[PDB]
Amino acid sequence: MRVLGIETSCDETGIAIYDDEKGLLANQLYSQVKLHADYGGVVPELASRDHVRKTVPLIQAALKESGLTAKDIDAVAYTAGPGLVGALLVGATVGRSLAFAWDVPAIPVHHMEGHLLAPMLEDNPPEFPFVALLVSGGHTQLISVTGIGQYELLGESIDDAAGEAFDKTAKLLGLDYPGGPLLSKMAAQGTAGRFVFPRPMTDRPGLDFSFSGLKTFAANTIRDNGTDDQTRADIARAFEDAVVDTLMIKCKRALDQTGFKRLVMAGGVSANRTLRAKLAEMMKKRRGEVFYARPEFCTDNGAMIAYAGMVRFKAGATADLGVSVRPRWPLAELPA
Amino acid sequence: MRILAIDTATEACSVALWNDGTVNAHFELCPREHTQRILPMVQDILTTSGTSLTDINALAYGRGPGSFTGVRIGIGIAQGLALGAELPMIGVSTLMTMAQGAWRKNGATRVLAAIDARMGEVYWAEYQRDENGIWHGEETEAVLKPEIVHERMQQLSGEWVTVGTGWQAWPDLGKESGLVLRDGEVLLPAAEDMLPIACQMFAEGKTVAVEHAEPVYLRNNVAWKKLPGK
Ligand SMILES: Nc1ncnc2c1ncn2[C@@H]1O[C@H](COP(=O)(O)OP(=O)(O)O)[C@@H](O)[C@H]1O
Ligand SMILES: Nc1ncnc2c1ncn2[C@@H]1O[C@H](COP(=O)(O)OP(=O)(O)O)[C@@H](O)[C@H]1O
Ligand SMILES: [Mg+2]
């Protein structure tokens, strides 16, 4: 069986084909980052326009890449939410109508379930149950996962998500948007320990997060200190180490609370190299296992959508002829 | 030939099929419902006419201008359909479609189309039908402030009919123009009226592959401000 997957939730157009015998047969990705960088944020109208420019051509490239033709596709899955309405609509209209013309099932996919399941795309995927740390641009959640569509929320951010926190602090350090990855690279240049940021909400028990106070601390530190390259590297490092310790501490507590032996990380922040290393080290001391996708499947991509599409198809989640999108769509509300 | 037309650029959703000498069409107001109605309409038309998507010679789509979201719905759906069944595509102006509507409803041959574009503008065109039924005036399409429309109308002459939601929002639009204006009786484009235009285009080879189908937004200044310095 093979599923075409379509991802247009924000500012990446992603198309992939996933075959359950042979694996990933195609993965096409266009990122709009240069279009939005000039603005310091994603401009929805422009994002929507550029999805139109890219979706159909990247579908054609996917089929050619894989050497398949229409008849070899069993279903078409597309991100229905959460995300920007305008963007989501482009991939959903193309996908649902393509499915109609090919006369195959159309599978609407929850963008964060895509992220959650991206580790399943690697060798040695996690078995249920596990704790999932979803850590993206606008999400930061701890989830107890007992099976497909059995997601119990355990902790979440009450303000900024970890990704936003990275991007917001990167902007203060003069980097282009989104600056999280660049902040991470600068950080490798930093003197460990020269500055020390709080680990918010780590002094009382509990699983929720807050990161807003961390920007504040960054900005004050950028104010009371020199603007040379090193001093900025050192601030980037301190910011990064603190976020990573916070995520780690909280993952520990959820592993404690659940008694689970498996930690799965996903979302764009799970590309962060320090984070990956620290959670792997932690799971080794606990004698459990950590899981994550390759770095390019942590951030938005089509592969995860084709995979999650396949899973939802097999779970019976097929759409009628209507097309709908859900810009806000809590993960806990998905059925099992 | 068989030609399937789809439109969602405005408050209306419509689908229509030119089926070798008869038309089978649907039209309704779908505010908030375009994406729930559009494929069921397509399905119903194909089934009731006993045609399938791969019997179609071309897919005509409402290219714009109009609702940015609407226009994208239209071309999204039209693109998956065309990609899926390997159909060539024919983009049709929503302004020109309303002109054709007026010709259909009351024999109008010179049309001033104005769509309410919001932000105190309208999408504008001057369409005139020759003795062969071809609509001239595509070069006049534009997004304009009413006072600029007014200036433009003073450079025109003769009798015109008015179509589109632009005239409802701004009913004094032709004040002191010097033209005789009559009500064209068309507020919205209908897929049914894209058909004669698309059939003509098909006969002449004015089609494009799905990867070259584009919306016409007319308003392209749509960002907020850039950061200091770029
Ligand atoms: N190596 C990294 N370190 C920290 N943050 C990263 C890294 N790579 C990507 N990010 C952040 O991940 C976020 C993008 O997450 P992603 O899941 O791709 O998008 P979305 O939030 O749109 O689902 C951005 O906040 C980005 O800055
Ligand atoms: N979130 C959505 N989901 C499905 N369809 C939508 C959505 N948003 C807009 N549309 C469709 O596009 C049409 C145009 O949207 P818009 O230009 O914002 O005008 P309005 O909201 O005033 O109707 C809507 O009437 C609706 O049918
Ligand atoms: Mg993105």
Author numbering:
A (entry chain A): 1 to 336
B (entry chain C): 1 to 230
Show the paper's wording.
We report here the crystal structure of the heterodimer YgjD–YeaZ from E. coli in complex with ADP that is bound at the interfacial region of YeaZ. We cocrystallized the YgjD–YeaZ heterodimer with ATP and MgCl2 and determined the structure at a resolution of 2.3 Å. The Mg2+ ion is located 6.2 Å away from the Fe2+/3+ ion and is liganded by the carboxylate side chains of Asp11 and Glu12, and close (3.7 Å) to the β-phosphate oxygen of the nucleotide. Interestingly, the Fo–Fc difference map calculated after structural refinement revealed an important residual electron density cloud situated at the YgjD–YeaZ interface. An ADP molecule could unequivocally fit the density and its refined B-factors were similar to those of the surrounding side chains. The adenine base lies on top of a hydrophobic depression created at the interacting interface of YgjD–YeaZ (YeaZThr69 and YgjDLeu89) but does not form any specific H-bond interactions with the heterodimer.
In archaea and yeast, the transfer reaction requires the kinase, putative endopeptidase and other proteins of small size (KEOPS) protein complex, composed of Kae1, Bud32, Cgi121 and Pcc1, complemented by a fifth fungi-specific protein Gon7 in yeast.
